[PDB]
Design a protein around this nucleic acid. Structure first.
Ligand code: NA
Ligand code: NA
Length: 327
DNA sequence: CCGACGTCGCATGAGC
DNA sequence: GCTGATGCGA
DNA sequence: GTCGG
């Protein structure tokens, strides 16, 4: 299915989605619109009527109406209006700064701050995270080609191992599924000395090392189990310098590691299928553990998990490679 | 008709 | 000062 | 906004 099929529609729905999230502060309306956009984006026919579209799950009466209007007129009146609305288009825009959510963007536009220029004139109203998001606004909205991701992995695995050879680290996300590009780097981390029934420096030392070799350049947030920050590949001599990229590193108990890896590998749709499965086989799977129900439905103790495959075994699925976890 | 729609670590605000 | 709600991002 | 108990 090509973009040129129903692209106008999915763009429209995605625009609408973003105003719900950032302007109207209606996060469920936001996800409803994205859900419709997504199911439509998969549908392999150019849509002819909102009635055709309504058949899809996630598309109801009100989106069917909008599709009709768009189909007949080539636009949506409501969207046209909000696009031209100075206040709301500015609120929607500021949220593209990482750390500026709908509430902070609301406040800014309230006092006159509407543009990146205005943000740059008012640094002392920005918190740490927001300032970082400003500084790297453009880099962050760029994608990371897999070749850079490989090079970033090399550095991450090398430096983690050098800190302590018993650490285990996995770059997950769409990268681990084989994607030709990524939006950030998600690293999952563990160590034999850290279990559920079990230093608070296991994460610190790794981050410190990645800072020391100047891979990690900034810190959005950091505590004993989750680090969120900025990184950058070393400049290849006289070449153009690489974009700064987003990198998360989280520490996970060794006995919850692979549930974490399975889950943060995705995809989202695969995760729902697999956890749907799953239930119907007598087990409940979350990001942490797999547990058995329960004739009355009462979940028992977490089951020992020592590989991704272990989880597949428990619910008699054949282990599926990350490459084939598209859904 | 009407509630669910994921959940949670961390930074920062607010209330005491 | 401590506690615990909220905003944010994933 | 959409779904579903
Ligand atoms: Na429907
Ligand atoms: Na943002």
């Amino acid at each position: 299915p090509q973009e040129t099929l129903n692209g106008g529609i999915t763009d429209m729905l995605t625009e609408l989605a973003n105003f719900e999230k950032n302007v109207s502060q209606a996060i469920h309306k936001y996800n409803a619109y994205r859900k419709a956009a997504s199911v439509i984006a998969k549908y392999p026919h150019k849509i002819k009527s909102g009635a055709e579209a309504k058949k899809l799950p996630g598309v109801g009466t009100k989106i069917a109406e909008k599709i009709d209007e768009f189909l007949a007129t080539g636009k949506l009146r409501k969207l046209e209006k909000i696009r031209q609305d100075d206040t709301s288009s500015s609120i929607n825009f500021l949220t593209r700064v990482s750390g500026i959510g709908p509430s902070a963007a609301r406040k800014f536009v309230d006092e006159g701050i509407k543009t990146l220029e205005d943000l740059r004139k008012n640094e002392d109203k920005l918190n740490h995270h927001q300032r970082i998001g400003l500084k790297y606004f453009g880099d962050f909205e760029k994608r990371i080609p897999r070749e850079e991701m490989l090079q970033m992995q090399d550095i991450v695995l090398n430096e983690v191992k050098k800190v302590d050879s018993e650490y285990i680290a996995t770059v997950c996300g769409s990268f681990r599924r084989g994607a030709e590009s990524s939006g950030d780097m998600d690293v999952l981390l563990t160590h034999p000395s850290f279990t559920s029934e079990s230093q608070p420096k296991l994460l610190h030392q790794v981050v410190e090392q990645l800072q020391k070799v100047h891979f990690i350049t900034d810190t959005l947030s950091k505590g004993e189990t989750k680090f969120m920050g900025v990184c950058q590949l070393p400049s290849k001599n006289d070449e153009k310098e690489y974009p700064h990229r987003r990198i998360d590193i989280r520490l996970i108990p060794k006995d919850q590691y692979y549930c974490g890896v399975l889950y943060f590998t995705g995809s989202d749709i695969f995760n729902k299928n697999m956890r749907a499965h799953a239930l119907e086989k007598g087990f409940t799977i979350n990001e942490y553990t797999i547990r058995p129900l329960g004739v009355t439905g009462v979940a028992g103790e977490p089951l020992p998990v020592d590989s991704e495959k272990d989880i597949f075994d428990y619910i008699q699925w054949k282990y599926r490679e990350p490459k084939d976890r598209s859904e």
